[PDB]
Amino acid sequence: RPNHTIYINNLNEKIKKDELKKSLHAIFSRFGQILDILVSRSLKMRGQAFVIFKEVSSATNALRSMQGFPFYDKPMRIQYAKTDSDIIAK
């Protein structure tokens, strides 16, 4: 089940697209060298964000730590992505 990418949801939708990005960068670069962190507030993909890592070990490292984490007045919910990013799917 493990993956390069981790899926977080139940985040605060009020937070700006670009603010939410830089928010997660400093808090998750604590585990690896993040490739890219795709987020949008579009109806389907709002309140949620994907974290693409260079190492899977670093993604696993980040996962088994911060589940249920209060972050911008909201519990954070980590779980691996099922299908990788187009940057990794090759």
Add this chain to the structure above:
RNA sequence: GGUCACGCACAGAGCAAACCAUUCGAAAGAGUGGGACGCAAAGCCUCCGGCCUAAACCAUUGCACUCCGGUAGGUAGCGGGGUUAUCGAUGG
């Protein structure tokens, strides 16, 4: 000469993009002053599509890498259409 189309001109006259100053706005943006990229309606109207915005209100717990909720504002200089209008090539 009207009416409706057309724009290769004359001739007069009209707005005014970027930028900057300043105010209103969360923002997109708009207003005025300066400025002139262009414009045959770059006069005006959000009715049809698109794009830009997302502060609040309701909507949503959602696995993306075409994008994509409502609502609301914006854009007429994004097209579409409605309406008003100037010149008049021995002009069609």
